[PDB]
Amino acid sequence: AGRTRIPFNGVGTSVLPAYQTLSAGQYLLSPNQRFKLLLQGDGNLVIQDNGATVWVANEQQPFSSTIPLRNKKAPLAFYVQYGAFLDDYSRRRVWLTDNSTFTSNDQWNRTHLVLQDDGNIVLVDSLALWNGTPAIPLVPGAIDSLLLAPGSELVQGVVYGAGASKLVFQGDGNLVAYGPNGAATWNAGTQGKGAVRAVFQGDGNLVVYGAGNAVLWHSHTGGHASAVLRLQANGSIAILDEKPVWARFGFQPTYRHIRKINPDQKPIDIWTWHF
């Protein structure tokens, strides 16, 4: 008793979800569209940079293993089941990633592959604690996403941008995310209720307070100090608890993981590592 895979149907997006079979001809693109992860018909798994191959899945890739594949019926396929696996009979091989040590069996359901805007492919244990906009696709790995760290006040009237989208704690006291076409994709519905403050707290809860620290609205995500709040260029807003467990560069099993930062100390949705 345990999950079976289904065919991937997300060609051109930046994420390969768990237990989904990517087959020949299918590909991911980074959100900025510069990079493409392609499974070729010749059985090579390839990353291309503006159309040119700059990486190939093989034995020379740090923290990956190649073991025999004797099963004759195994179709060419690439998929994620905590670790990533490339079944390539043509070379009698399974190529797979040596992930960081697993902490829970739940990770098998939550871990997906992200093709980032910096060209890295990263396996990320990802849990959406709150998703304000379930109809809008989650798009990890984009340089133009806005991330707020816990402990970030949303100053009233300030427009926080992510490409053409924005998040605003408005003069009328509503907390609103606007999508690329100028329409609201989500709002807390707190206009006219005396809202005085909106804050993504240190405990990972997004809260709008009124007079006397009255709670007018909250995301019910308290107790997650490692969560981030993300506004995407497509208008998606969500609170996520995420950690990487493999990457093709930068990653080492014993290194600590952190998000890259802008020159003004703001975090970016791109994973990196250091001791």
Numbering used by the authors: 2 to 276
Task: Provide the authors' original text about this structure.
For the protein containing two similarly folded domains, we constructed site-specific mutants affected in carbohydrate binding and domain chimers from LlpA homologues to show that mannose-specific sugar binding mediated by one domain is required for activity and that the other domain determines target strain specificity.
Binding site IIIC accommodates the disaccharide Manα(1–2)Man and the pentasaccharide GlcNAcβ(1–2)Manα(1–3)[GlcNAcβ(1–2)Manα(1–6)]Man.
